[PDB]
A paper describes a structure:
The structures of the complexes of Gst with azotochelin and 5-[name] were solved using the apo protein as a search model. In the complex with azotochelin there was a single protein complex in the asymmetric unit, with density from Glu25 to Lys300, while the crystals of the complex with 5-[name] contained two independent complexes both with density for residues Glu24–Lys300. The ligand structures superimpose closely on the apo model, with r.m.s.d.s over 273 equivalent Cα atoms of 0.61 Å for the azotochelin complex and 0.48 Å for the 5-[name] complex. As expected, the Fe atom of the ligand in both Gst complexes is bound by the four catecholate O atoms and the conserved His218 and Tyr279. Several of the loop regions on the surface of the protein have high B values and show high flexibility in all three structures, with some variation between the three. However, the regions around the siderophore site are well ordered. The solvent tolerance of Gst is slightly lower than that of Pth, with an approximately fivefold increase in K d observed at 20% DMF.
Author numbering: 24 to 300
Write the structure that this text describes.
Amino acid sequence: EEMTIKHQLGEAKVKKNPEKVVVFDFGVLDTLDKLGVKVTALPQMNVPKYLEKYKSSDYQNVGSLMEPDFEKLSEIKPDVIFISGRQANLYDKLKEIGPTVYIGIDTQHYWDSFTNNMKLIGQMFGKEKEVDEELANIEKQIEEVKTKAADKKALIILTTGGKVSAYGKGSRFGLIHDVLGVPAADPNLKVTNPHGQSVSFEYIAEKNPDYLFVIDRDAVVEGKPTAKQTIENALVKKTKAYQNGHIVYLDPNYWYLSGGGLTSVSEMIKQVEEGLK
Ligand SMILES: O=C(NCCCCCNC(=O)c1cccc(O)c1O)c1cccc(O)c1O
Ligand SMILES: [Fe+3]
């Protein structure tokens, strides 16, 4: 009836089937959506398109992803607060208000970490069988995309402010290489930074990948698509990716604002599969 949860930032004591659930990670939000679990509150300042129903006033607004409304959280008295990387620095302040579970993915072990996070949610809400069904469905997706991914060397690029940053194995977006079997154009790219590693257009040209996965950060942070325009560049057009029409624009509503949930991971895999073949 009381759960002891060991997470990356500490230990939370949470009542099973907690009544008031507050969510600061959109992957967890889409997980609770999928499982039919009622949510009390979330930061409504920037909600992913696919989760737009959670913009409803039926949900209490607890601010933005990096600025929680502590007054409002105090008023709610949550039974559980779910957080991920963007709120890690505020863990103590949140835990003072209610039980706080860090449920970001450890990208050094994406599949294991994802699995554990989802199974925890199943245990907390009595949804263990439905979580297991969805995890099996996702495994089937992964296997299928692995067959498509052979020999297709890829570089992962995020665009922001007319600039490009790169990601590789073990990184925020490492699962493309680490789970879905897409080979790395740059196997030595060792990225642990949320916003990736600054690189030149010349660097992209030099790596000359078969496939270029592009995540438009400005589309969700600034509200205007800038990825196509940013990729419009003399040196990038020299790559096999540009030539062969293998520049794949991954939806930042899923990849950037969200990720690590039942629905977001499923849709992420679909976007990779569709991009390859
Ligand atoms: O710690 C983080 N950011 C601190 C620096 C913020 C720099 C300012 N960013 C924005 O205004 C912004 C707004 C909405 C969503 C975002 O992710 C943003 O980065 C962070 C952690 C994990 C994932 C991210 O993505 C992050 O950012
Ligand atoms: Fe960010």
